């Protein structure tokens, strides 16, 4: 390989031998794209004229009142498609074309990535098939329809748990036999090398923009940048540019679900064991005898039962800290943002918001400049929060 597949001891290429040629081809294309100014130029055009970049950096007005905390929200909820997922899906669809592929395979859990794959495909003219656990399809109707309207073929997975886990397996099986014509548009900064590297590099404008934006508005870097962690791409797009700014804290928030103690959560990075699955070596949700398990969370999109290897790595060296937020705490951060700032956040992003609220409420007299990555909008969640309320 041209690049290193490992982050410390996490990462690798744990796939059947038949898929190695596809991974090598993808890595080469990526390195070449990355050096191509004509590629850079086309990616940027789409991000700006189509998706809506740069996204705003909103200073909160009312939520930090009575506190010495200043909170800024990076508004990825204002991105075309309604979430950060759109950034990377565009660079991947362009890379697919550069390799002469004409088909796209994507896996989706909550449906956000699915939707983003469909829109990118519709626009750049690729045929798109989406695997979605049949359980997910079943209660993700709104996003399903949205996918079909854009002309994508949705394939429900009935095998295993009929959940995201099962959708990612089906997508790998498929790519096995069709990788000469199809490109696998994986959804997060996980799976086999070079995906953790590609998804991060196509998600790094988040953090690059946040940095420039905050220096302009506060004349200084933030004390901490916080982001939810399902598989890790919004978190790594936000953190990337700050990694060398050692004064800046990096906090990732995993779903605590009903509470760690209950066993019903989705926080493998901090509460699971390293294993090998989905083509990588990283922390995951598994039984004592090594069977992979599902991640539980009120938020549909923090369902990946493992996490990206660069995250498992940033934790190990102490560069970034990972915390968990429970269902109840995310629901409360959802309601507070709505009523005080007039922004409906995605329940996923509510986990990161719940954590910044905890930082300011516990130490109200501590002066701190925080930035929360608002990964998506919460329109898709009003029914849930509704039926919770």
């Amino acid at each position: 390989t041209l690049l290193n597949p490992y982050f410390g001891e996490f990462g690798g290429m744990y796939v059947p031998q038949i898929l190695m040629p596809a991974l090598n081809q993808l890595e080469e294309a990526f390195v070449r794209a990355q050096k191509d100014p004509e590629f850079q130029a086309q990616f940027a055009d789409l991000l700006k004229n189509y998706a809506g970049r740069p996204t705003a950096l909103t200073k909160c007005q009312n939520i930090t009142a009575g506190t010495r905390t200043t909170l800024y929200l990076k508004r990825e909820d204002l991105l075309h498609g309604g979430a950060h997922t759109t950034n990377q899906v565009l660079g991947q669809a362009l890379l697919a074309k550069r390799m002469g592929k004409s088909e796209i395979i994507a896996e989706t859990g909550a449906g956000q990535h699915g939707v983003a794959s469909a829109l990118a495909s519709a626009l750049l003219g690729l045929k798109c098939r989406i695997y979605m656990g049949a359980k997910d399809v079943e209660r993700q109707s709104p996003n399903v329809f949205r996918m079909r309207l854009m002309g994508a073929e949705v394939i429900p997975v009935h095998s295993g748990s009929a959940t995201l886990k099962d959708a990612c397996n089906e997508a790998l099986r498929d790519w096995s036999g069709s990788y000469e014509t199809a490109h696998y548009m994986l959804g997060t900064a996980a799976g086999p090398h070079p995906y953790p590297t590609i998804v991060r590099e196509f998600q790094r404008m988040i953090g690059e923009e946040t940095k420039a934006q905050i220096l302009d508005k506060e004349g200084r870097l933030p004390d901490a940048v916080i982001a939810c962690v399902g598989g890790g791409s919004n978190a790594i797009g936000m953190f990337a540019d700050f990694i060398n700014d050692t004064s800046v804290g990096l906090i990732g928030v995993e779903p605590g679900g009903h509470g760690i103690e209950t066993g019903e959560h989705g926080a493998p990075l901090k509460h699971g064991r390293v294993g090998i699955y989905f083509g990588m070596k990283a922390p995951m949700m598994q039984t004592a005898d090594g069977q992979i398990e599902e991640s539980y969370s009120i938020s549909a999109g923090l369902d990946f039962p493992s996490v990206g290897p660069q995250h498992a790595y940033l934790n190990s060296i102490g560069r970034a800290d990972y915390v968990s937020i429970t269902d109840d705490e995310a629901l409360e951060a959802f309601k507070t943002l709505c009523r005080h700032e007039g922004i409906i956040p995605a329940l996923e992003s509510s986990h990161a918001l719940a954590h910044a609220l905890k930082m300011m409420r516990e130490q109200p007299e501590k002066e701190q400049l925080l930035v929360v990555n608002l990964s998506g909008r919460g329109d898709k969640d009003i029914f849930t929060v509704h039926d919770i309320l």
């Binding site: 744990y14 796939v15 059947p16 031998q17 790998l172 099986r173 294993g275 699955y277 005898d289 992979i292």
Partner: protein, 257 residues
């Protein structure tokens, strides 16, 4: 590793190919499973390839996916698998036994520890479905240290560099695939001193066994053809053994030639 060496020596002296059935341990139940393996052997299997139910067989197809389901639904666990393996070995001292595993089940309790229990229970080789040659180092080293043959798959899309690596790192036999000139593959393997090649592609008829042996393969592995019968006869267990018996005799007879 020995059991293979020995087998291939005997088959040669009676100019005949090896017939190797694949079955899922504890499918459709523990006892029905042991009953099925005694029948395969009895019917003429030259070796065995057994799978340990894994939750996410990202490298298997539906027939095999449904087999793990039934096993799981049976309460089969890896540990129960190692008990069954010790019993099989105890009744059949000479048949080579190979395991088809997923990296995680191998890695769970330590790589070295996994090959150690293999060795202790009398398994002869292990194929890790999701470890390409590029990442096999820790797996192959632990295997060699425990006298276990590390099996590698040779894919349709295989190049020279790979042919070279597979010939050099593998032992027991080379797993030859076909993804939905082999005579050249087989040729190239022989040239590089690779372990005997077993055609695993899609053997379901005596016709294909004979062709494999003719192509230059040392025999063929019947990947799901067997899982098929269990499936079809889930209904009538006695009818299940009978069809298996017959199928195996059928396939074995065609290896001779």
């Amino acid at each position: 590793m020995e059991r293979y060496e020995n087998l291939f020596a005997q088959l040669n002296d009676r100019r005949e190919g090896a017939f190797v059935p694949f079955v899922t341990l504890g499918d459709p139940g523990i006892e029905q499973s042991l009953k099925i393996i005694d029948t395969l052997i009895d019917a003429g299997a030259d070796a065995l390839e057994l799978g340990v139910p894994f939750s996410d067989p990202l490298a298997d197809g539906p027939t095999i996916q449904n087999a793990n389901l039934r096993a799981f639904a049976a309460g089969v666990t890896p540990a129960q698998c190692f008990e069954m393996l010790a019993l099989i070995r105890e009744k059949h001292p000479t048949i080579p036994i190979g395991l088809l595993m997923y990296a995680n089940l191998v890695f769970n309790n330590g790589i070295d520890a996994f090959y150690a229990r293999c060795e202790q229970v009398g398994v002869d080789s292990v194929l890790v479905a999701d470890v390409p040659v590029e990442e096999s180092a820790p797996f192959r080293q632990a295997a060699l240290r425990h006298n276990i043959a590390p099996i590698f798959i040779c894919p349709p899309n295989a190049d020279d560099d790979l042919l070279r690596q597979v010939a050099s790192y593998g032992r027991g036999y080379t797993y030859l695939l076909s993804r939905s000139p082999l005579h050249h593959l087989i040729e190239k393997l022989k040239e590089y001193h690779a372990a005997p090649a077993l055609q695993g592609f899609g053997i379901s008829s005596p016709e294909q066994v004979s062709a494999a042996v003719r192509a230059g393969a040392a025999g063929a592995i019947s990947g799901s053809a067997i899982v098929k019968i269990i499936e079809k006869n889930l209904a009538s267990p006695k009818q299940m053994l009978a069809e298996l018996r017959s199928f195996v005799s059928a396939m074995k007879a065609a290896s001779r030639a």
